[PDB]
């Protein structure tokens, strides 16, 4: 049948604060978030490309966003190591499209990030495959995701 | 200050809902998602790659979620296009990685996702940078974001 | 006799607001302004070049501020181009120059730019001479313009 | 958030008092100010290039006024010197722009000629970049600037 | 037995005021001080450069902060010159050291920086070495220095 | 407007003791400092450069003053390492030059050294950009720093 990828949960998402550490590039911008030692560094950066539009075709922008923090693993055991955790965010949306289709895909998008421990771990550390679940015939049909 | 670099909005994530396609290779799979016409495709990858021990160094687990969807633009207008639009999810886990603090980074990375229609014209479309706002001092300290 | 050359008009200047684009260099940053979709780009370019001194030669500032905005044309009508319009204030003053002098000629300078819709048409659109006015011998003398 | 690029000052400009001097050309005419010597030259210079239709392409219209104005520097001391400091407004309008948006666009350039002594040594002379001010949330939105 | 190398005396540090002239770099930005004209420029220049991380090896923060002040000598006399003097901080701190140890060693580092005239001539224009005291074996042991 | 870019603390200077260790060159001579272990060595080394004129030239004095102290950072945890933390003052005063100035801009330069923890620890530790703080109009003017 139709089978949910990722069920909704009503886990809201974390808000984001920070401050401006260094801007690497015109179109690069590097953010320092809490917990950000020298030993042990946080940082979300943030590329954004403007369009260049070529004649006869409208630009294409894209936008890139990356959490990056280097966490000291098995720091009580020996041999214990400060290894860089990364999760990005980069999108490629074209001139002409809506903003009202591109946030329902968004809102889409965001879904499988506001998941239980055990299928984060499951899926983003384990890389166990994923459990595709049957969506109850009897229950009302999921939002279309326009 | 301290700055708001995505304030959280009560705007809940839409369900993901589909339907398997085909499966590329061992460790990527394609998915059908509603609204998938073979003119305009509306799809779902899913390239998840385990880790590989290297001599002395722990694998690194890496996951990409790609939700990629063809937009006919300006249909009543003249140079209607077929245009695709995409919006990546890709994630670097190393082994050692605690799934709490990964967790952590997931719901902030949520969190510029759910936005309103109005931030996200201006970022993911516009391209202008991102809307920085002071956190009242008065106010209480927001998440840490672990 | 003497003649206005641009009477004063009571019409206050429009305050300027905006949001920061991008700096394009260390010289050259460019604003956003209200109203930059980016279908009908709306932007401050700003350029400030500092004085370089010379041998027995003081440097001289220039300083550039050009509005641009591309506007749909003939919408309604067949064959609608987008086409811009731009505004700039461009100015050197060598080093030696005193404010005060500087700010008469400022003041000046601004008059032209606001005037009533008819000498606004007359001059910058279709083209016309400037309207000169005989200054009346028997009303007081208009300021000097130091 | 959204920041005053050049807050508006209740500092009227002075109405330009002249005298027409030479017409150079059929599109240029040179209007002498008072205070000219003609050791100390200034002058109004004013070109406005009419629009040549091309085919499939409609005019626009090109407008420059420039006020010249050289003066001696550093006369007390020795090496005083006549030095020019120019201020130019430059304006192209292509032929389908309505008079209420090009109006918008002047009154909003007059503004940065507008300001006080601080701020004008700070920009046109000393060349600093531009004063942002981050507009209170609480204050009513400036004006729109069509 | 044990030397004063730099007596420490009852002589505040004047603060640092200024204004931002330009960002020359990501990691260096210039600051135009008070009494900064274009021919005699007076300036700070900050560029702090961030620890890179090599294999097996922590990074380092490098610091450097610079004042430039070109002043005119022997005005009155023939062969007057306008000739800079510089007076720069550079430190180098490595990752894991810690704030306390660093702060001991710079509060010791500032104490040349507040001498009298006399010792300060002495020292940094005339080129003698520097004045060495014996520590009165009598009085309490100066500061240990961390 | 105008920034504080250092706000001067009423945080006096550690006096500088000490023992002269050795004499490199003519123009270098080294002291060792309390803590100087043979293991972690603490060393002030001073290289005072006299000013050599050339025809019609005045000369330049050259004066370095670099304190170095190799720390055990992460002593307690294995593959605890000894690093070294450098902090230099270098400064070249020509010979015109005169010592009221120049003193000025010593106290000046000095006022960063002496700042609190949190400051300290933000800029020459982590390397995060330098937070200019508005200087209250209301407030009397700082000094000039001559």
């Given at each position: 049948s139709i089978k949910y990828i990722f069920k909704k949960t009503d886990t809201l998402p974390r808000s984001v604060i920070g401050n401006v550490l260094r801007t690497t590039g015109p179109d690069t911008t590097v953010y320092s978030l809490p917990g950000h030692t020298p030993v042990n560094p946080f940082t979300l950066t943030a590329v954004s490309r403007l369009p260049v539009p070529r004649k006869g075709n409208a630009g294409t922008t894209k936008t890139t966003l990356s959490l990056r923090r280097e966490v000291t693993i098995n720091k009580g055991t020996d041999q214990e190591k400060i290894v860089p955790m990364i999760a990005r965010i980069e999108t490629s949306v074209p001139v002409g499209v809506s903003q009202d289709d591109f946030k329902a895909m968004i809102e889409g998008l965001a879904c499988p990030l506001l998941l239980d421990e055990i299928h984060v771990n499951d899926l983003?550390?384990?890389?166990l495959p994923i459990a595709t679940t049957d969506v109850p015939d009897n229950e009302p049909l999921p939002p279309a995701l326009l």
């Open positions: 983003f550390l384990s890389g």
